[PDB]
Amino acid sequence: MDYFNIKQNYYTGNFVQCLQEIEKFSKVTDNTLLFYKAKTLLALGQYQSQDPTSKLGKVLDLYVQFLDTKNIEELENLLKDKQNSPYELYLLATAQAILGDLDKSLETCVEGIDNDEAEGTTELLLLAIEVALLNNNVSTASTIFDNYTNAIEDTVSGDNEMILNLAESYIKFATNKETATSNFYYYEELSQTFPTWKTQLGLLNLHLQQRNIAEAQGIVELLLSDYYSVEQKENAVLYKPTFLANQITLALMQGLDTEDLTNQLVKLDHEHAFIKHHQEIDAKFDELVRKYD
Amino acid sequence: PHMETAIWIKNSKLPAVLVAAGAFDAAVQALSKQVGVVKLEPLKKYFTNIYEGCRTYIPSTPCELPAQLGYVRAYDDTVSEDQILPYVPGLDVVNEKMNEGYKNFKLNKPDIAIECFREAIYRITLLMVDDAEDEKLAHKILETAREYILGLSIELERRSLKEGNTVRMLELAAYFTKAKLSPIHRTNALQVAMSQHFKHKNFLQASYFAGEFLKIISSGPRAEQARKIKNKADSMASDAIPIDFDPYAKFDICAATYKPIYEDTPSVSDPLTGSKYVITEKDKIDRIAMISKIGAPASGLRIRV
Question: Any idea where the domains of chain B sit in the sequence?
């Protein structure tokens, strides 16, 4: 239906505006509206329980609370055996994957991708593909994606065509296919229409991907340019970790020392993919030095 | 060892790729049979950089989801699925580091310069190259790199002497002159030698070196002193202190003991560096880049895809 705007702003990263698109509805106790609102508020770091009445807006509070204690107790609890909507599940799947249970997470996702609620389904198709690729499952991601695609018709592709292209993108990003054409033009366009850290950072990745350390270099200097790292401190402090991680990899291509000072920031800061891999690899090496005495 | 990774290991088993594919042991074992690599510690940073250098993360949608891994391949869409390999920073950077070396050589900081050449030797070791010109070149750089590590290691060992050892100190300042550096740089070696053999009334060398220098430097402040020194010296074929050094000979300087290895002299080489030592040093680590075993047999440095 209509909130094509609310959405088109969310998946491009500017919650500055994605929230203004929801303001245009005077609390229509709509689940789609509750979802993106609560979700957009979290993003702008201004979440505020949108009501404990809804057995969704309630899962939301539980999920937000979860994020602050890596504790799925009441979240997994207040959902078990109960037949809930994809939206309620999506929040559960993330909780599970954030914790590391990537296999029980894709299950949760599929469980709901294939049930009742007309609404919330495409939002899950994405989270399913994301959670699959995280867990390193490319073809399952592709299949989860292919089955849903070649089936569903023109209307779902209406509002959610954007939610879909995104998933298709992440698959292209791992598959490393059309990384220079179809895929590059995809992020290319997004940044030149929605200059967010999301769109930008994506583009930066397509450059690193492509060896364009030059263009890559630019996209970086720019993200340091006040317009982003000050005139947008908001959804910019949100992406700092991943951004440092991107700089490290760029810096490695140019053979720069920075490899260390830079990931000091991300280390003594976040514990994400790059640092997960970094400690993994760092240790596996010392494990080899012991080994050759 | 995943969808992407497998392709790599399937497509090339050369160290650099093994490292990027996260298969460290496999790589350790290859550098061992191929270049005689034994001591691993000063090689960690290099395994790490290769690995992290071909991986990049793009943000996941709900931001508090962990980022998604993306691979950086060596070539583009238009290549045999056979030739799907990881991106490994190549020679652009090996030079960049070779220069830091030269910069530090002109500045007179051997420590910080040796540190650089060593780094370039390490990067060459885990390099990935496609052309044959580049493979030829990689070795050319490796050669030079060790000639500077060796030459400076000698100058350093010379500076580490307490007076009273002037016999050996004149021996070293002369051998430094034998390190196959580029002429522009060999100048500073000659000047050190030429001037120390002067100082100890050994104008038999003092003259030699100075001339050997003047024939690379027409005029200039320092070049002018070379002249004034070669004259005074030429007028008294003195032999203050005879040293184990024959300019009219063929020999290599032992990278460990810094004594000359003449053509008869039995010696052993270093599989990686190629530096030469006296038989005394067999089975110890090379001094040019504490990584390989001297004399251990190797099947060649594997750089090319």
Answer: 1-305
Phi, psi angles (nearest 5°) of residue A292: -120, 75
Amino acid at residue number A149: T
Helix (H, G, I), strand (E, B) or coil at B44: helix
| Domains of chain A, first to last | 1-293 (1.25.40.10)
Closest by CA to B17, choosing from B97, B93, B85, is B85
- For residue A89, the tally of other CB atoms under 10 A from its CB is 24
Q: Measured between alpha carbons, how far apart are the two ends of chain A, in Å?
A: 67
Decide if A254 touches B, using CB distance below 8 A: yes
Q: Which residues contact B73 (CB under 8 A, 6 or more apart)?
A: A176, B54, B84, B85, B86, B87
Judge whether B57 and A242 are in contact, CB under 8 Å.
Answer: yes
CA separation for the pair B181, B187 (Å, rounded): 9
Give the C-alpha separation, B198 to A138, whole Å: 73
Contacts for A109-114: CB closer than 8 Å, 24+ residues apart: A110/A144, A112/A84, A112/A85, A112/A86, A113/A86, A113/A144, A113/A148
CB contact under 8 A, B38 and A292: yes
When scoring A10, A253, A277, A282 by the number of chain B Cβ atoms within 10 A, the one with the most, hence best to mutate, is A253
Report phi then psi at A176, rounded to 5. 65, 30
CA torsion B83-B87-B89-B91 (nearest 10°) is 10
d(CA B41, CA B290): 9
Sole residue written with tokens 């990537």: A102
Distance between CA B64 and CA A97 in Å, rounded? Answer: 10
Closest-CA distance, A282 to chain B, in angstroms, reads 7
Contact in structure between A27 and A12 (CB atoms under 8 Å): no
The residue of chain B with its CA nearest to that of A178 is B77
Instruction: Tokens 């994506």: give the residue.
Output: A202
**Phi and psi at residue B180, in whole multiples of 5°?**
-60, 65
Q: How many CA atoms lie within 13 A of B65 on its CB side?
A: 27
Amino acid at B229: I
**Which amino acid appears at position B6 of this protein?**
A
Amino acid identity, position A113: I
State the Cα–Cα distance between residues B20 and B14, nearest whole angstrom.
Answer: 10
For an interface test with B, give the residue of A242, A266, A270 to mutate (most B CBs within 10 A). A242
Phi, psi of B149 (to 5 degrees): -60, -45
Can you give the length of chain B in residues? 305
Instruction: State the number of CA atoms in the 13 A half-sphere of A248 facing the CB.
Output: 29
Phi, psi (deg, nearest 5) at residue B70: -140, 140
Which phi and psi (to 5°) does residue B197 adopt? -80, -20
DSSP 3-state of B262: strand
Nearest CA among A275, A224, A40, A258 for reference residue B62? A40
- In this structure, the dihedral spanned by the alpha carbons of residues A38, A43, A44 and A49, taken in order and rounded to 10 degrees, is 30
